[PDB]
Design a protein around this ligand. Structure first.
Ligand SMILES: CN1C(=O)C[C@@](C)([C@@H]2C[C@H]2c2ccccc2)N=C1N
Length: 361
C-alpha cells in the first residue's frame, strides 16, 4: 500500500488529517481522521479560520437531503445541512463514493484557529452518528459501494507530525513483532475492555470495571490518555511514587499547569494496559513509555467523566488495526514510535479470569 503510506499530516496537538476531494469537479479539503465520531462533516462557509471550504454551488453531483443537524460537545459545537456528493481520497483507494456530507454552516470553538484541516472524517459506527443511525457513515458507504475490504489501519507517528491511514488493509512495514487483537465490544464507538493496569509492572489493584467506567474507547481525535477519575487518581500517585527522584507541583498532574526541563527519561515508569484478548481468559498488554505520555513538556494523562479514552498518547506508540470485518482491533509495536534502553511493547498471551466482568452496563 505504498501509495497510502505517509498520507497523514498535522500539527502537534491539532490532530491528524488526510486529503480528500468532494464534489464534481473535485474540491480538495484537509479532513481530520477521527475514530471517535461517525459523521463526515465539512465546513461549507467562509469561516475566517479556515483555509478552504465545501462550496455546494460548484458541485454538479451534490444532492440536498433537506435536513439540518445540530451537534453540541464538551466545549465546541456545530450545526449543518445534510446532503450527498461524490467523495474521493487522493492518497487512498482509486475509487469514488457517494457519501453523506454534513455541510457545516455554523460552529463555535470546534475548528482550530491555526489548523490546516477544515472537516471531520468520523470513522466510528452509525449508532452514534447524528442525527441518528439512519445516516450512513462514510466507511460504511465505502464498503457497500466498492470492493474495498471492511477495515483500515492507522499509524500515528508524531512542528509537523505525520502518519498513515491504510484504507482496506494492513501495511506490514509499519509495525514490528506481532499484532494482537482485542474485541470491539459494541459497534458504536470503538469500545474495548481493559482488564488490568500496571504502572512500571505494579498492578493498581482496582476493580477492573473502574478501568472501563463507563467505557473505554480508541480515539484518534483525542490527544491524551484520558482515564476515569478514580483510575486517574490511582494512576498519578503510582506514577508520582515511581518518580520520587525529582518533585513536581500538584496542579501540574491535573494539566492545570506545564513543566519544563533542560535539553539532554528513566525516572519515569512505563505504563501497561491489559486488554481483553480473542480467547476466553486470555489477554495481552500494550506498554508505553514517558516519551508517549510526556508531550513536548506537558503531562498527557487527564481525567474523564466519559470513561477511558485511548488517544494519541496510546496510538503514537502502536500500529492500530480497525478490523471491522472481524469486530476487533489489532495492536502492534509501531515502527515509528519514539524511544530510548526501553521500548513500547505489545506482549502476550496472559491468563486473566472474568474479563467480561470488567465491562460496564
Ligand atoms: C474527542 N472528540 C470530540 O470532542 C468531538 C470530535 C467530533 C471533535 C473532532 C474532535 C475535535 C477535538 C478537539 C478539537 C476539535 C475537534 N471528535 C472527538 N473524538
Amino acid at each position: 500500500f505504498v501509495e497510502m503510506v505517509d498520507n497523514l499530516r498535522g500539527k502537534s496537538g491539532q490532530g491528524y488529517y488526510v486529503e480528500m476531494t468532494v464534489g464534481s469537479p473535485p474540491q480538495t479539503l484537509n479532513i481530520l481522521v477521527d475514530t471517535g465520531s461517525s459523521n463526515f462533516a465539512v465546513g461549507a462557509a467562509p469561516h475566517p479560520f479556515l483555509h478552504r471550504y465545501y462550496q455546494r454551488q460548484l458541485s454538479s453531483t451534490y444532492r440536498d437531503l433537506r435536513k439540518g443537524v445540530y451537534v453540541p460537545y464538551t466545549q465546541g459545537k456545530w450545526e449543518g445541512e445534510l446532503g450527498t456528493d461524490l467523495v474521493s481520497i487522493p492518497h487512498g483507494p482509486n475509487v469514488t463514493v457517494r457519501a453523506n456530507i454534513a455541510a457545516i454552516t455554523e460552529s463555535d470553538k470546534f475548528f482550530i484557529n491555526g489548523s490546516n484541516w477544515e472537516g471531520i472524517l468520523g470513522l466510528a459506527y452509525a449508532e452514534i452518528a447524528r442525527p441518528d443511525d439512519s445516516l450512513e457513515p462514510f466507511f460504511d458507504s465505502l464498503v457497500k459501494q466498492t470492493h474495498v475490504p471492511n477495515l483500515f489501519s492507522l499509524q500515528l507517528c508524531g512542528a509537523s507530525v505525520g502518519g498513515s491511514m491504510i484504507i482496506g488493509g494492513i501495511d506490514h512495514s509499519l509495525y514490528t513483532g506481532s499484532l494482537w487483537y482485542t474485541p470491539i465490544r459494541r459497534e458504536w464507538y470503538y469500545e474495548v475492555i481493559i482488564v488490568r493496569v500496571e504502572i512500571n509492572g505494579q498492578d493498581l489493584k482496582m476493580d477492573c470495571k473502574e478501568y472501563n467506567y463507563d467505557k473505554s474507547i480508541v480515539d484518534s481525535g483525542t490527544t491524551n490518555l484520558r482515564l476515569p477519575k478514580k483510575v486517574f487518581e490511582a494512576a498519578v500517585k503510582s506514577i508520582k511514587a515511581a518518580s520520587s527522584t525529582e518533585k513536581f507541583p500538584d496542579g501540574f498532574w491535573l494539566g492545570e499547569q506545564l513543566v519544563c526541563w533542560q535539553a539532554g527519561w528513566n525516572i519515569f515508569p512505563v505504563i501497561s494496559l491489559y486488554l481483553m484478548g480473542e480467547v476466553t481468559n486470555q489477554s495481552f498488554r500494550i506498554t508505553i513509555l514517558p516519551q508517549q505520555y510526556l508531550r513536548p513538556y506537558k503531562f498527557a494523562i487527564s481525567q474523564s467523566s466519559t470513561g477511558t479514552v485511548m488517544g494519541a498518547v496510546i496510538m503514537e506508540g502502536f500500529y492500530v488495526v480497525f478490523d471491522r470485518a472481524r469486530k476487533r482491533i489489532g495492536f502492534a509495536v509501531s515502527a515509528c514510535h519514539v524511544h530510548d534502553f526501553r521500548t513500547a511493547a505489545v506482549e502476550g498471551p496472559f491468563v486473566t479470569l472474568d474479563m467480561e466482568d470488567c465491562g460496564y452496563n
